[PDB]
Every structure is written in structure tokens, then in C-alpha cells.
Design a protein around this nucleic acid. Sequence first.
DNA 1: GGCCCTCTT
DNA 2: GGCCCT
Lengths: 220, 222
Amino acid sequence: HGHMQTLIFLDLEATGLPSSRPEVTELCLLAVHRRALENTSISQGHPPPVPRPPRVVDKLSLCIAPGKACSPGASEITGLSKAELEVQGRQRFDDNLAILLRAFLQRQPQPCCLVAHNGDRYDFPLLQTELARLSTPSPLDGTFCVDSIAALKALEQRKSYSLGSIYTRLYWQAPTDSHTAEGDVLTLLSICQWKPQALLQWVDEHARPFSTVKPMYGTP
Amino acid sequence: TLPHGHMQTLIFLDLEATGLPSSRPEVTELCLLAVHRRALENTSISQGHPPPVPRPPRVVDKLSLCIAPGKACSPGASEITGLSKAELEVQGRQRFDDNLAILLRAFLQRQPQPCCLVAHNGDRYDFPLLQTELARLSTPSPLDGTFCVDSIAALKALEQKSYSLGSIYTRLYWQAPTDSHTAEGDVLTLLSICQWKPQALLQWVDEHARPFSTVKPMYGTP
DNA sequence: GGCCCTCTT
DNA sequence: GGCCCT
Ligand SMILES: [Co+2]
Ligand SMILES: [Co+2]
Ligand SMILES: [Co+2]
Ligand SMILES: [Mg+2]
Ligand SMILES: [Mg+2]
Ligand SMILES: [Mg+2]
Ligand SMILES: [Mg+2]
């Protein structure tokens, strides 16, 4: 349990929204030691400048071929499609991907905590569903997770708690590369660099094992 | 298809208590106002800006009880509710006890089933508190088989801003509520807010009603 | 799809 | 009724 040593910012892109029984099309992890986060110094400004990511970070970004077509809306905003992913030789969500995730997580200082925007309702349940289809034991065993919407709400102290709304509320600039996995992870990181010590305290208190996350859907 | 069928009775509920959740509060007052769904189906459409406060239905069952808590009220609680443990006892009020459970069961039992409790911030206060108080008793729960919904969630859906009871009431009707922080007063205020868009409320309630047995107690007890 | 709706005394 | 995720 806490204190959490590493925060792993997570974002998934997929074929659609949960009622559609979606499948992952892109995945990004950005791992940062809690020290790098608290070391961030939001410079003077009105609006405050967007902080640079810490120098020392681990990053993984992967495109994934789904077993079903993206919804038109999902394709439009992500810039991905099943057809393009296939011709670019992307592989399905498979055992080897699970091995990659575990190895990546395992070289992070422990314990780790996944951080995703609306994670409790989307990213974590969806990820649980994808992993459940595999033969590998869950690569996220021992890993914790929190939802940054819950975090940001509690840290205050609004019309919207969407990723973009929060970012703009803080920095009054548009996020870049929205609805791309890496783009959204970097945006989330910038938000979480605003008041890192308060965030880390909240994370330490509210982090729960990823293994407690119920799958989005069950594929009986 | 509706998850639990039509809710035939809406039971507007409010509690007064010794304090707020972190204090392990105990109930000091309880009011139930039971209304057949038809009384809501029969409520007039709210027209005008502002509309008048809806007329309460003629046919209603009401229960309002003052209850001696097991601990003193916080000074803040006493100030706003006008109740204190000592004075409730001077007035000979009984504790939240087996008798009360039997009373509540009988009251609910002559309502058409199923019943759905409606309380403002009920999901985070009234329902968990009531669950805790009933859990203390050896008597079986009189609320098994009943459903519940939070009217904050309801009014947010219906309004499509503060969502305190008084704020909503004032926003809809341009009037100050009366007898705030009394159980019966707040129940009548709640009734009025829920009568604003009565057909839409009923549909939302039917869609979001959840079994009371799924409500987690506010706090644990020896 | 599931839960949240920051108020409650 | 819509968040909020795609
Ligand atoms: Co679409
Ligand atoms: Co009937
Ligand atoms: Co209506
Ligand atoms: Mg996302
Ligand atoms: Mg994204
Ligand atoms: Mg109340
Ligand atoms: Mg009250």
C-alpha cells in the first residue's frame, strides 16, 4: 500500500463507448516517480505557463488492432480505424502485449498507481476486460489505480470536469493532440503537476488495487 | 423495460439528526409523506414564470415523529432544527426503537406497493443514516422490499446552480421555503419541487429506483 | 454502460 | 437527462 512511489498516467483510445462493447485501439503509459512530480515548479504567470514534463520519465505508446470496426465518431476523433491499423500491421490485444505491460510496470519503483481520467468508469474496466480474454495472469497484479476526476474534484477545495475543461481552466490554452493516447496522457500529466503534493496525498489515501476493478463487459 | 416495475407509491422522506456524517449522527425527527403515483400523474403542468407552488394532493398519508437520540445534538444542529436531546426527553420522546420499526412497517404496508423513498441528498445522508439506525435494532428492517432515489439527482436530470433544497425551491418558484430544517417542512418543500415536472419525475424515479437493501450504512455499530 | 450529480444536520 | 470516457 501507500505511499505510492510511481504514478503511471494512463489513457486508452478505443472503438467506441461502453454500451457498444468497445475494444482498445491505442494505449499509452507515462510513468513518473513521485519526486519528479513534486519537483515540478509551476512558474509565475497569468495564465500560468504549462509546465514541462519531468526529465526522467518512462513512456510506452502502442497502437492495437481491434476485432471490430470503430464507430464513425471514434474514428473521427482518434484518427484511427480498424482498416488502417491492420494495413499498418498492428497486432490484436494479446498475451505478448500483456508481457510488455508487466515488464514495463515491473521496472517502475513499487508500488505503482495508474492514473486515468474517468478511469473508474472507462479505462480501468475496459482494460480489465481486454486482459481477462488472455492466458497470461493479469500483468497489473500488485498495481494500484485512481480516477483523476475524483482527485481533481476533491482538490477543489464547475460546468465540466472533462480533461479539456480542467486543462483550460488551469492554463487557458487548448490541449494538443486530443483523443490520442499519448496526447491525452501528457495533458493529464500537466493537470496533475498543478498541485502535486496535494494530489499525491489524495492518491495515497484513495488508491485501490486494479484487481478490484470490475470488467466493463463479460463476454460469457 | 423498467428495472423494478412502476413505483406505485412515492414516499417523500426527511430526517433531522444530531449532526453531519463525520459525527456518527442519530435521528431526532422523521417525516414520511406517502403519495400514490396517480396523485403525481394528476398534478397540473407548471406554467408561467414563475409558476405557482403546486397544490399538494388531497389524498396523502403522513407520519411525523420526534425521536430522542442516544447522543446530544451538535449546537449547530439544534440551532437550525430547533431540537435538542434533552428537550425531546422533557417531551417524553422515545428512542429509535423496535416500536418505531413496527410503526414504520405498518405505515408502509398500507401503501400500494412497491414504495420508493424520495429524499434530498438521500444517497449520501438520509438513506445511509436510516440503514444505520435500523441496523442497530434486533427487529427486522421495515424497509426490506422498498426502493429509494435521491431528488438531487432527479432535479438535475429534470432541470437538464446550487442544488440545496432551498436553492432549488427558490429557483423554481421565486419563493423562500417555510419551516426549513424541520422534518415535515422539508418534506413539503421536497414534494413541491418534485411536483414541478411530475410526469418526468415519475419516469425518472421508475428508471432509477434502487432497492433500499443495497444502501450502505452511514457508520458501523457494536 | 455505470455512477455520478455537494449536499445532508 | 447528461456527465464522462471513445
Ligand atoms: Co458514432
Ligand atoms: Co396500486
Ligand atoms: Co412533467
Ligand atoms: Mg481517456
Ligand atoms: Mg484519449
Ligand atoms: Mg434533509
Ligand atoms: Mg430536514
